[PDB]
Amino acid sequence: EGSFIDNSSVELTTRNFYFDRDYQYPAAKDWTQGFILKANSGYTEGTIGFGLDVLATAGFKLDADAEHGGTGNLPRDTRTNEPADSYGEIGVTAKAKMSQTELRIGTLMPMNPVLVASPARLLPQTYRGISLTSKDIKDFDLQAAYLDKVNHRDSTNYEKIKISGVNGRFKGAETDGLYYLGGNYQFNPALKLTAFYMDVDDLYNQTMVGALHQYKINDTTNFSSQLRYYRSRDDGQAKAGLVDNDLYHAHFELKHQNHKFIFGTFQHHGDTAFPYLTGGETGLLIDTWPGEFLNPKEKAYSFRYEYDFKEYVPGLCFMTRYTTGHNIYAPNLGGTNLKERETDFDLGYTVQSGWLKNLGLRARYAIYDNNMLSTANIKPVNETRINIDYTWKFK
């Protein structure tokens, strides 16, 4: 009984994480230590191959006053509100696969343009469900899933999925489950086109379409164009209320030598905001941090620089971004035509290479403001994140 175990991988990340959200509601602030264990067995020999994945996860308090609770890093007692001394999920996934087409059941971590299990706090959020995925049809990279429960990043248990009522944009309310499906086509070597559909029962459905385009000029000098469209609405009884949003997101990139230069825009049309699920973020951006820019009717613009430092220090890498929003419609929260500001700074040192393969060191700072009412959930804030990740590889 060889492959299953000869090919198994076994990795253990250790993170030390400091999170502080300060306003001028008190600070939401903690210092925490994490442990993430992934064991994915190889595949059994045969026409069909069988396997077993394991996620084992544990967080511990280091300094965390109860009055600064509810960052996403520790759960908190629903009687007393103390953030826990410690906590841990154990999840398990089965696998089957012929060719390059696989089928999974149990803990899952979807990551596509409509849906993202959340990496953004100490521990990941997971769903449970069934996926199917396949690259066997030529040029098509596909995925589908049916998901029925969710385990949060700051919880221990599988709950029912539900929709965020942030800012009063929608009545929060829970579903029985959701599916997605889509993937993408490679049209020709420069161009690549994407399509998804996600139906969340009695809550909302969504259409995503898109296209990425590559164009090179030098060895050092490079440029891409991505144009996406998202049509968000109601499946059946619509227990959330009205959902009527059309989003257009264009995103361009010029890389020259070690520098990048990036422009984004969101353009919202319709009567409401762009909906999403609780305990996480969106499949729109890989991160955009405390400010999110999804208010109803909003028009927003984003500018980004990056600098890779190979020349001086292999592994070192820097970023900064200015993001502005407007014609924002929230009469409950102080007006039509409101606005949002953010300034992000981000410094990542990661050692690929060497005997410290996989050692991470990272600062992130954000300065977010608005002119909306103090009684909004998304509130003017200055957030700090520092983390120290290392990973062992036992096999």
mmCIF file of C-alpha atoms in Angstrom:
data_model
loop_
_atom_site.group_PDB
_atom_site.id
_atom_site.type_symbol
_atom_site.label_atom_id
_atom_site.label_comp_id
_atom_site.label_asym_id
_atom_site.label_seq_id
_atom_site.Cartn_x
_atom_site.Cartn_y
_atom_site.Cartn_z
ATOM 1 C CA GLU A 1 0.000 0.000 0.000
ATOM 2 C CA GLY A 2 2.511 2.493 -1.420
ATOM 3 C CA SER A 3 1.287 5.570 -3.412
ATOM 4 C CA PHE A 4 -1.275 6.699 -0.822
ATOM 5 C CA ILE A 5 1.550 7.004 1.675
ATOM 6 C CA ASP A 6 4.740 7.201 -0.476
ATOM 7 C CA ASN A 7 3.259 10.301 -2.157
ATOM 8 C CA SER A 8 1.576 11.901 0.908
ATOM 9 C CA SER A 9 2.570 15.524 1.757
ATOM 10 C CA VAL A 10 2.703 16.815 5.342
ATOM 11 C CA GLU A 11 3.153 20.593 6.094
ATOM 12 C CA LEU A 12 2.730 22.625 9.332
ATOM 13 C CA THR A 13 2.576 26.377 9.250
ATOM 14 C CA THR A 14 3.140 28.350 12.413
ATOM 15 C CA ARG A 15 1.857 31.996 12.453
ATOM 16 C CA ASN A 16 2.325 34.764 14.911
ATOM 17 C CA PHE A 17 -0.166 37.547 14.144
ATOM 18 C CA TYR A 18 -0.810 41.105 15.481
ATOM 19 C CA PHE A 19 -4.072 42.812 14.484
ATOM 20 C CA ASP A 20 -5.091 46.402 15.648
ATOM 21 C CA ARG A 21 -8.114 48.418 14.292
ATOM 22 C CA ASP A 22 -7.946 51.882 15.958
ATOM 23 C CA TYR A 23 -10.715 54.618 15.586
ATOM 24 C CA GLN A 24 -10.923 58.091 17.313
ATOM 25 C CA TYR A 25 -16.729 51.337 19.659
ATOM 26 C CA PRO A 26 -13.160 50.921 21.090
ATOM 27 C CA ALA A 27 -10.086 49.354 19.340
ATOM 28 C CA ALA A 28 -10.537 45.823 18.021
ATOM 29 C CA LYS A 29 -7.028 44.533 18.773
ATOM 30 C CA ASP A 30 -5.255 41.188 19.642
ATOM 31 C CA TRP A 31 -1.978 39.252 19.510
ATOM 32 C CA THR A 32 -2.392 35.563 18.690
ATOM 33 C CA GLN A 33 -0.431 32.410 17.702
ATOM 34 C CA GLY A 34 -1.638 29.900 15.074
ATOM 35 C CA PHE A 35 -0.927 26.316 13.833
ATOM 36 C CA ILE A 36 -2.154 24.940 10.496
ATOM 37 C CA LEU A 37 -1.598 21.295 9.580
ATOM 38 C CA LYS A 38 -2.261 19.962 6.053
ATOM 39 C CA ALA A 39 -1.937 16.262 5.337
ATOM 40 C CA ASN A 40 -2.944 15.278 1.796
ATOM 41 C CA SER A 41 -2.330 11.513 1.102
ATOM 42 C CA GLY A 42 -1.260 10.396 -2.302
ATOM 43 C CA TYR A 43 -3.673 8.528 -4.584
ATOM 44 C CA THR A 44 -4.396 4.794 -4.598
ATOM 45 C CA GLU A 45 -3.097 2.884 -7.647
ATOM 46 C CA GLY A 46 -5.899 2.021 -10.078
ATOM 47 C CA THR A 47 -8.041 3.449 -12.922
ATOM 48 C CA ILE A 48 -9.706 5.471 -10.234
ATOM 49 C CA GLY A 49 -7.494 6.847 -7.488
ATOM 50 C CA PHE A 50 -8.566 7.451 -3.917
ATOM 51 C CA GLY A 51 -7.179 9.676 -1.188
ATOM 52 C CA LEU A 52 -7.707 11.469 2.071
ATOM 53 C CA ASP A 53 -7.007 15.130 2.939
ATOM 54 C CA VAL A 54 -6.767 16.389 6.517
ATOM 55 C CA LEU A 55 -6.853 19.993 7.922
ATOM 56 C CA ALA A 56 -5.997 20.420 11.588
ATOM 57 C CA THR A 57 -6.046 23.861 13.055
ATOM 58 C CA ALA A 58 -5.533 25.579 16.326
ATOM 59 C CA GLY A 59 -5.366 29.146 17.681
ATOM 60 C CA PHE A 60 -4.074 30.466 21.082
ATOM 61 C CA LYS A 61 -4.410 33.797 22.926
ATOM 62 C CA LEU A 62 -1.268 35.758 23.820
ATOM 63 C CA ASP A 63 -2.682 39.208 24.736
ATOM 64 C CA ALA A 64 -6.422 40.001 24.261
ATOM 65 C CA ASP A 65 -8.605 42.184 26.333
ATOM 66 C CA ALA A 66 -12.317 41.438 26.121
ATOM 67 C CA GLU A 67 -13.172 45.055 25.490
ATOM 68 C CA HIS A 68 -11.274 44.848 22.138
ATOM 69 C CA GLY A 69 -12.924 41.637 21.032
ATOM 70 C CA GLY A 70 -14.148 40.595 17.611
ATOM 71 C CA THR A 71 -11.125 40.907 15.299
ATOM 72 C CA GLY A 72 -11.520 37.678 13.307
ATOM 73 C CA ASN A 73 -8.626 35.869 15.131
ATOM 74 C CA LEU A 74 -10.277 34.482 18.324
ATOM 75 C CA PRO A 75 -13.844 33.377 18.903
ATOM 76 C CA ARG A 76 -15.697 34.837 21.853
ATOM 77 C CA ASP A 77 -18.050 33.344 24.461
ATOM 78 C CA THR A 78 -21.608 34.325 23.638
ATOM 79 C CA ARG A 79 -22.486 34.589 27.410
ATOM 80 C CA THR A 80 -19.467 36.567 28.641
ATOM 81 C CA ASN A 81 -17.787 37.951 25.501
ATOM 82 C CA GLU A 82 -14.206 36.803 26.740
ATOM 83 C CA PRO A 83 -12.221 35.990 23.582
ATOM 84 C CA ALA A 84 -11.137 32.333 23.950
ATOM 85 C CA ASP A 85 -7.869 31.226 25.666
ATOM 86 C CA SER A 86 -7.609 28.701 22.792
ATOM 87 C CA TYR A 87 -9.541 26.776 20.041
ATOM 88 C CA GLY A 88 -9.361 24.106 17.142
ATOM 89 C CA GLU A 89 -11.302 22.597 14.167
ATOM 90 C CA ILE A 90 -10.314 19.149 12.642
ATOM 91 C CA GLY A 91 -11.675 18.864 9.029
ATOM 92 C CA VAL A 92 -11.446 15.972 6.567
ATOM 93 C CA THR A 93 -11.874 15.665 2.791
ATOM 94 C CA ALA A 94 -12.245 12.556 0.617
ATOM 95 C CA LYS A 95 -10.884 12.570 -3.025
ATOM 96 C CA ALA A 96 -11.525 10.545 -6.222
ATOM 97 C CA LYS A 97 -9.766 11.139 -9.594
ATOM 98 C CA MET A 98 -9.363 9.697 -13.103
ATOM 99 C CA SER A 99 -7.156 11.618 -15.617
ATOM 100 C CA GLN A 100 -7.243 15.397 -14.672
ATOM 101 C CA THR A 101 -10.783 15.375 -13.367
ATOM 102 C CA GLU A 102 -11.332 15.138 -9.589
ATOM 103 C CA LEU A 103 -14.230 14.858 -7.148
ATOM 104 C CA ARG A 104 -14.087 15.900 -3.474
ATOM 105 C CA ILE A 105 -16.346 15.652 -0.443
ATOM 106 C CA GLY A 106 -15.885 17.255 3.007
ATOM 107 C CA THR A 107 -13.811 20.325 3.911
ATOM 108 C CA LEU A 108 -13.441 22.708 0.917
ATOM 109 C CA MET A 109 -11.774 26.011 0.098
ATOM 110 C CA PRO A 110 -13.276 27.526 -3.052
ATOM 111 C CA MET A 111 -11.393 30.274 -4.770
ATOM 112 C CA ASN A 112 -12.791 31.605 -7.960
ATOM 113 C CA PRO A 113 -14.234 34.829 -9.176
ATOM 114 C CA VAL A 114 -17.548 34.427 -7.281
ATOM 115 C CA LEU A 115 -16.489 32.817 -3.970
ATOM 116 C CA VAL A 116 -13.414 32.706 -1.665
ATOM 117 C CA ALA A 117 -12.909 30.783 1.598
ATOM 118 C CA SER A 118 -11.125 33.490 3.653
ATOM 119 C CA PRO A 119 -7.386 33.512 4.223
ATOM 120 C CA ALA A 120 -7.444 36.947 5.825
ATOM 121 C CA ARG A 121 -7.446 36.004 9.527
ATOM 122 C CA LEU A 122 -5.229 33.663 11.529
ATOM 123 C CA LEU A 123 -7.136 30.630 10.295
ATOM 124 C CA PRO A 124 -8.984 29.897 7.090
ATOM 125 C CA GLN A 125 -12.693 29.765 6.673
ATOM 126 C CA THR A 126 -13.796 26.495 5.026
ATOM 127 C CA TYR A 127 -17.016 25.244 3.551
ATOM 128 C CA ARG A 128 -18.245 21.639 3.337
ATOM 129 C CA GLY A 129 -19.784 20.104 0.284
ATOM 130 C CA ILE A 130 -19.055 18.420 -2.998
ATOM 131 C CA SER A 131 -16.828 19.752 -5.762
ATOM 132 C CA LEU A 132 -16.020 18.378 -9.192
ATOM 133 C CA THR A 133 -13.066 19.901 -11.214
ATOM 134 C CA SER A 134 -11.585 19.154 -14.699
ATOM 135 C CA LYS A 135 -8.897 20.119 -17.247
ATOM 136 C CA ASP A 136 -9.569 17.021 -19.511
ATOM 137 C CA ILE A 137 -11.622 18.845 -22.087
ATOM 138 C CA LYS A 138 -9.002 20.632 -24.227
ATOM 139 C CA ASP A 139 -8.400 24.405 -23.351
ATOM 140 C CA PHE A 140 -11.155 24.390 -20.662
ATOM 141 C CA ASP A 141 -10.264 24.629 -17.025
ATOM 142 C CA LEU A 142 -13.596 23.968 -15.157
ATOM 143 C CA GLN A 143 -15.003 23.796 -11.555
ATOM 144 C CA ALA A 144 -18.420 23.191 -9.983
ATOM 145 C CA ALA A 145 -19.510 22.802 -6.359
ATOM 146 C CA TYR A 146 -22.554 22.310 -4.097
ATOM 147 C CA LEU A 147 -21.944 23.776 -0.611
ATOM 148 C CA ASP A 148 -24.314 23.559 2.364
ATOM 149 C CA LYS A 149 -22.430 24.510 5.520
ATOM 150 C CA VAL A 150 -19.665 27.000 6.354
ATOM 151 C CA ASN A 151 -17.053 26.980 9.208
ATOM 152 C CA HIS A 152 -15.790 30.386 10.054
ATOM 153 C CA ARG A 153 -12.232 31.468 10.711
ATOM 154 C CA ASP A 154 -13.173 32.499 14.250
ATOM 155 C CA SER A 155 -15.400 29.471 14.947
ATOM 156 C CA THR A 156 -15.247 25.799 15.573
ATOM 157 C CA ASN A 157 -18.370 24.500 13.891
ATOM 158 C CA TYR A 158 -20.259 23.984 10.645
ATOM 159 C CA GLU A 159 -23.211 26.556 10.538
ATOM 160 C CA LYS A 160 -25.565 27.477 7.790
ATOM 161 C CA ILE A 161 -24.440 29.937 5.184
ATOM 162 C CA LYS A 162 -25.749 33.492 5.423
ATOM 163 C CA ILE A 163 -25.714 36.864 3.864
ATOM 164 C CA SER A 164 -24.227 39.986 5.183
ATOM 165 C CA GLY A 165 -26.443 42.829 6.335
ATOM 166 C CA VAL A 166 -23.494 45.356 6.576
ATOM 167 C CA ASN A 167 -24.481 49.027 6.476
ATOM 168 C CA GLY A 168 -28.178 47.926 6.334
ATOM 169 C CA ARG A 169 -27.744 47.062 2.689
ATOM 170 C CA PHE A 170 -29.665 43.802 2.992
ATOM 171 C CA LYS A 171 -31.555 41.917 5.626
ATOM 172 C CA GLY A 172 -29.159 39.278 6.837
ATOM 173 C CA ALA A 173 -30.727 35.857 6.597
ATOM 174 C CA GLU A 174 -29.611 32.261 6.158
ATOM 175 C CA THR A 175 -29.845 29.649 3.422
ATOM 176 C CA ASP A 176 -30.036 25.875 3.038
ATOM 177 C CA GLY A 177 -27.134 25.919 0.596
ATOM 178 C CA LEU A 178 -25.467 27.226 -2.569
ATOM 179 C CA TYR A 179 -23.885 25.992 -5.806
ATOM 180 C CA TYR A 180 -21.463 27.561 -8.290
ATOM 181 C CA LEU A 181 -20.107 26.568 -11.656
ATOM 182 C CA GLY A 182 -17.903 27.896 -14.428
ATOM 183 C CA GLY A 183 -14.166 28.060 -15.167
ATOM 184 C CA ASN A 184 -12.410 29.324 -18.205
ATOM 185 C CA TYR A 185 -11.500 28.900 -21.821
ATOM 186 C CA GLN A 186 -8.197 29.587 -23.443
ATOM 187 C CA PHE A 187 -9.269 31.279 -26.735
ATOM 188 C CA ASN A 188 -5.835 31.948 -28.275
ATOM 189 C CA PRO A 189 -2.413 32.429 -26.558
ATOM 190 C CA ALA A 190 -2.901 36.178 -25.776
ATOM 191 C CA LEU A 191 -6.601 36.061 -24.745
ATOM 192 C CA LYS A 192 -8.467 34.097 -21.986
ATOM 193 C CA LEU A 193 -12.217 34.313 -21.177
ATOM 194 C CA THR A 194 -14.064 33.430 -17.997
ATOM 195 C CA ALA A 195 -17.678 32.617 -17.028
ATOM 196 C CA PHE A 196 -19.342 31.759 -13.690
ATOM 197 C CA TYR A 197 -22.789 31.295 -12.149
ATOM 198 C CA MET A 198 -23.563 30.987 -8.382
ATOM 199 C CA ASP A 199 -27.250 30.403 -7.124
ATOM 200 C CA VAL A 200 -27.716 30.852 -3.326
ATOM 201 C CA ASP A 201 -31.181 29.415 -2.451
ATOM 202 C CA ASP A 202 -33.918 31.945 -1.762
ATOM 203 C CA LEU A 203 -31.353 34.707 -1.445
ATOM 204 C CA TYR A 204 -29.525 35.661 -4.664
ATOM 205 C CA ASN A 205 -28.102 34.414 -7.943
ATOM 206 C CA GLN A 206 -25.161 35.865 -9.805
ATOM 207 C CA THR A 207 -23.650 35.958 -13.326
ATOM 208 C CA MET A 208 -20.005 36.708 -13.851
ATOM 209 C CA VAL A 209 -18.386 37.157 -17.251
ATOM 210 C CA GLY A 210 -14.869 38.289 -18.122
ATOM 211 C CA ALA A 211 -11.778 38.441 -20.281
ATOM 212 C CA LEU A 212 -8.024 38.754 -19.522
ATOM 213 C CA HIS A 213 -5.602 39.931 -22.344
ATOM 214 C CA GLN A 214 -1.722 39.730 -22.409
ATOM 215 C CA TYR A 215 0.607 41.917 -24.545
ATOM 216 C CA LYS A 216 4.432 41.909 -24.170
ATOM 217 C CA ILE A 217 6.910 44.398 -25.609
ATOM 218 C CA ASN A 218 10.450 43.868 -24.095
ATOM 219 C CA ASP A 219 11.958 41.193 -21.757
ATOM 220 C CA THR A 220 11.552 43.692 -18.961
ATOM 221 C CA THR A 221 8.262 45.234 -20.254
ATOM 222 C CA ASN A 222 4.716 43.826 -19.976
ATOM 223 C CA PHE A 223 0.882 44.882 -20.034
ATOM 224 C CA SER A 224 -2.570 43.344 -19.286
ATOM 225 C CA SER A 225 -6.200 44.219 -19.673
ATOM 226 C CA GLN A 226 -9.058 42.595 -17.714
ATOM 227 C CA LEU A 227 -12.668 43.579 -18.222
ATOM 228 C CA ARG A 228 -15.355 41.877 -16.015
ATOM 229 C CA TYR A 229 -19.207 42.192 -15.566
ATOM 230 C CA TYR A 230 -21.346 40.922 -12.679
ATOM 231 C CA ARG A 231 -25.208 40.594 -12.672
ATOM 232 C CA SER A 232 -26.436 40.041 -9.085
ATOM 233 C CA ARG A 233 -30.314 39.311 -8.401
ATOM 234 C CA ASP A 234 -32.965 37.098 -6.333
ATOM 235 C CA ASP A 235 -33.417 33.042 -6.395
ATOM 236 C CA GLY A 236 -37.155 32.423 -5.277
ATOM 237 C CA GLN A 237 -38.509 33.820 -2.053
ATOM 238 C CA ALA A 238 -35.715 36.392 -1.723
ATOM 239 C CA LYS A 239 -35.617 36.361 2.114
ATOM 240 C CA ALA A 240 -32.912 39.101 1.944
ATOM 241 C CA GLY A 241 -34.998 41.771 0.212
ATOM 242 C CA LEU A 242 -34.328 43.443 -3.114
ATOM 243 C CA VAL A 243 -31.021 42.606 -4.857
ATOM 244 C CA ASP A 244 -30.440 44.626 -8.113
ATOM 245 C CA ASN A 245 -26.816 45.264 -8.851
ATOM 246 C CA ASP A 246 -24.720 45.407 -12.069
ATOM 247 C CA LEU A 247 -21.020 45.807 -11.592
ATOM 248 C CA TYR A 248 -18.368 46.663 -14.247
ATOM 249 C CA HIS A 249 -14.719 46.201 -13.106
ATOM 250 C CA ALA A 250 -11.795 47.149 -15.364
ATOM 251 C CA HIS A 251 -8.235 46.490 -14.160
ATOM 252 C CA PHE A 252 -4.988 47.314 -16.079
ATOM 253 C CA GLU A 253 -1.326 46.534 -15.311
ATOM 254 C CA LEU A 254 2.007 47.832 -16.675
ATOM 255 C CA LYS A 255 5.129 45.973 -15.463
ATOM 256 C CA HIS A 256 8.487 47.314 -16.410
ATOM 257 C CA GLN A 257 11.705 45.775 -14.918
ATOM 258 C CA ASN A 258 10.943 45.333 -11.222
ATOM 259 C CA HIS A 259 8.141 48.050 -11.110
ATOM 260 C CA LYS A 260 4.355 47.496 -11.532
ATOM 261 C CA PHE A 261 1.670 50.157 -12.193
ATOM 262 C CA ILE A 262 -1.928 49.289 -11.763
ATOM 263 C CA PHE A 263 -5.245 51.009 -12.341
ATOM 264 C CA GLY A 264 -8.635 49.655 -11.263
ATOM 265 C CA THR A 265 -12.228 50.902 -11.410
ATOM 266 C CA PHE A 266 -15.600 49.652 -10.030
ATOM 267 C CA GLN A 267 -18.756 51.017 -11.668
ATOM 268 C CA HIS A 268 -22.012 50.058 -9.811
ATOM 269 C CA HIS A 269 -25.455 50.389 -11.437
ATOM 270 C CA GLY A 270 -28.930 49.407 -10.118
ATOM 271 C CA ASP A 271 -30.859 49.915 -6.822
ATOM 272 C CA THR A 272 -28.579 48.030 -4.334
ATOM 273 C CA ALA A 273 -25.065 47.100 -3.201
ATOM 274 C CA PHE A 274 -23.154 44.017 -4.387
ATOM 275 C CA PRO A 275 -23.988 41.132 -2.107
ATOM 276 C CA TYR A 276 -21.720 38.745 -0.184
ATOM 277 C CA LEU A 277 -21.557 36.134 2.571
ATOM 278 C CA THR A 278 -20.462 36.697 6.225
ATOM 279 C CA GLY A 279 -17.092 35.800 7.839
ATOM 280 C CA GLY A 280 -15.172 36.837 4.718
ATOM 281 C CA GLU A 281 -14.536 38.979 1.652
ATOM 282 C CA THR A 282 -15.168 38.686 -2.143
ATOM 283 C CA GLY A 283 -13.832 37.005 -5.360
ATOM 284 C CA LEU A 284 -13.306 40.433 -6.934
ATOM 285 C CA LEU A 285 -9.954 41.306 -5.479
ATOM 286 C CA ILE A 286 -7.264 38.987 -3.925
ATOM 287 C CA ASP A 287 -7.192 41.451 -0.992
ATOM 288 C CA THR A 288 -8.571 45.105 -0.564
ATOM 289 C CA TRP A 289 -8.533 45.028 3.335
ATOM 290 C CA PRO A 290 -10.786 47.102 5.645
ATOM 291 C CA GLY A 291 -12.331 49.340 2.949
ATOM 292 C CA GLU A 292 -14.347 47.498 0.322
ATOM 293 C CA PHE A 293 -16.182 49.947 -2.106
ATOM 294 C CA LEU A 294 -19.383 48.058 -2.779
ATOM 295 C CA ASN A 295 -22.029 50.583 -1.699
ATOM 296 C CA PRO A 296 -25.069 50.946 -3.949
ATOM 297 C CA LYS A 297 -24.499 53.160 -7.120
ATOM 298 C CA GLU A 298 -20.866 53.767 -6.170
ATOM 299 C CA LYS A 299 -18.191 54.721 -8.819
ATOM 300 C CA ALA A 300 -14.581 54.059 -7.568
ATOM 301 C CA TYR A 301 -10.979 54.369 -8.816
ATOM 302 C CA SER A 302 -7.725 52.754 -7.654
ATOM 303 C CA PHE A 303 -4.016 53.359 -8.256
ATOM 304 C CA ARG A 304 -1.209 51.043 -7.328
ATOM 305 C CA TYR A 305 2.587 50.866 -7.455
ATOM 306 C CA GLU A 306 4.750 47.781 -6.667
ATOM 307 C CA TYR A 307 8.524 47.186 -6.408
ATOM 308 C CA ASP A 308 10.213 43.778 -6.357
ATOM 309 C CA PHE A 309 13.753 44.071 -4.808
ATOM 310 C CA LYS A 310 15.708 41.122 -6.328
ATOM 311 C CA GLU A 311 18.541 43.545 -7.282
ATOM 312 C CA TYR A 312 19.215 44.465 -3.704
ATOM 313 C CA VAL A 313 17.498 41.696 -1.616
ATOM 314 C CA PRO A 314 16.022 38.537 -3.041
ATOM 315 C CA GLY A 315 12.580 38.015 -1.476
ATOM 316 C CA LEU A 316 11.947 41.615 -0.302
ATOM 317 C CA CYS A 317 8.922 43.204 -2.012
ATOM 318 C CA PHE A 318 6.965 46.565 -1.579
ATOM 319 C CA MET A 319 3.452 48.074 -2.365
ATOM 320 C CA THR A 320 1.279 51.157 -1.900
ATOM 321 C CA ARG A 321 -2.212 52.106 -3.231
ATOM 322 C CA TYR A 322 -4.688 55.056 -3.304
ATOM 323 C CA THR A 323 -8.354 54.193 -3.650
ATOM 324 C CA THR A 324 -11.225 56.843 -3.853
ATOM 325 C CA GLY A 325 -15.153 56.234 -4.177
ATOM 326 C CA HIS A 326 -18.298 58.426 -4.967
ATOM 327 C CA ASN A 327 -22.007 58.953 -6.098
ATOM 328 C CA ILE A 328 -22.594 56.561 -3.023
ATOM 329 C CA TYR A 329 -26.280 56.038 -2.123
ATOM 330 C CA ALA A 330 -27.145 55.418 1.524
ATOM 331 C CA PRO A 331 -29.931 57.692 2.697
ATOM 332 C CA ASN A 332 -30.275 55.725 6.021
ATOM 333 C CA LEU A 333 -26.517 56.563 6.643
ATOM 334 C CA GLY A 334 -26.402 60.285 5.831
ATOM 335 C CA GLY A 335 -27.072 61.027 2.114
ATOM 336 C CA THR A 336 -27.022 60.246 -1.605
ATOM 337 C CA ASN A 337 -23.700 61.207 -3.257
ATOM 338 C CA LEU A 338 -21.413 60.252 -0.264
ATOM 339 C CA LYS A 339 -17.709 59.315 -0.536
ATOM 340 C CA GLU A 340 -14.763 56.956 0.651
ATOM 341 C CA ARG A 341 -10.864 57.294 0.812
ATOM 342 C CA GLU A 342 -8.058 54.687 1.548
ATOM 343 C CA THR A 343 -4.281 54.613 1.516
ATOM 344 C CA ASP A 344 -2.602 51.202 1.758
ATOM 345 C CA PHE A 345 1.113 50.472 2.515
ATOM 346 C CA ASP A 346 2.366 46.885 2.352
ATOM 347 C CA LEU A 347 5.868 45.396 2.913
ATOM 348 C CA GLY A 348 6.499 41.629 2.303
ATOM 349 C CA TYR A 349 9.760 39.721 2.948
ATOM 350 C CA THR A 350 9.373 36.014 2.025
ATOM 351 C CA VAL A 351 12.339 33.502 1.787
ATOM 352 C CA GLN A 352 11.884 31.061 -1.023
ATOM 353 C CA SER A 353 15.443 29.624 -1.447
ATOM 354 C CA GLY A 354 17.756 28.526 1.465
ATOM 355 C CA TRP A 355 17.380 26.338 4.595
ATOM 356 C CA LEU A 356 14.572 28.789 5.731
ATOM 357 C CA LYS A 357 12.415 27.927 2.701
ATOM 358 C CA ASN A 358 8.922 29.312 3.512
ATOM 359 C CA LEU A 359 9.696 31.912 6.198
ATOM 360 C CA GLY A 360 7.356 34.970 5.954
ATOM 361 C CA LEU A 361 7.634 38.532 7.373
ATOM 362 C CA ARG A 362 5.062 41.182 6.600
ATOM 363 C CA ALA A 363 3.820 44.711 7.459
ATOM 364 C CA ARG A 364 0.482 46.030 6.197
ATOM 365 C CA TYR A 365 -0.963 49.450 7.184
ATOM 366 C CA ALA A 366 -4.242 51.025 5.996
ATOM 367 C CA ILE A 367 -5.640 54.562 6.382
ATOM 368 C CA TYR A 368 -9.479 54.460 5.622
ATOM 369 C CA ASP A 369 -11.952 57.458 5.864
ATOM 370 C CA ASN A 370 -15.481 58.432 4.872
ATOM 371 C CA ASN A 371 -18.192 61.156 5.312
ATOM 372 C CA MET A 372 -21.019 58.711 6.132
ATOM 373 C CA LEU A 373 -22.687 58.510 9.540
ATOM 374 C CA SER A 374 -20.892 57.167 12.627
ATOM 375 C CA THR A 375 -23.662 54.535 12.855
ATOM 376 C CA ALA A 376 -22.382 52.668 9.747
ATOM 377 C CA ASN A 377 -20.627 49.311 10.221
ATOM 378 C CA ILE A 378 -17.883 50.309 7.714
ATOM 379 C CA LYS A 379 -16.347 53.118 9.711
ATOM 380 C CA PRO A 380 -13.289 55.385 9.448
ATOM 381 C CA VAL A 381 -10.368 53.367 10.753
ATOM 382 C CA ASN A 382 -6.520 52.930 10.758
ATOM 383 C CA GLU A 383 -5.584 49.190 10.643
ATOM 384 C CA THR A 384 -2.266 47.450 11.204
ATOM 385 C CA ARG A 385 -1.307 43.784 10.425
ATOM 386 C CA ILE A 386 2.040 42.139 11.121
ATOM 387 C CA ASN A 387 2.682 38.434 10.770
ATOM 388 C CA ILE A 388 5.455 35.853 11.091
ATOM 389 C CA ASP A 389 4.707 32.620 9.227
ATOM 390 C CA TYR A 390 7.037 29.640 9.098
ATOM 391 C CA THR A 391 6.244 26.210 7.577
ATOM 392 C CA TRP A 392 7.660 22.733 8.352
ATOM 393 C CA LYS A 393 7.548 20.052 5.723
ATOM 394 C CA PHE A 394 7.704 16.649 7.348
ATOM 395 C CA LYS A 395 7.161 14.793 4.006
#
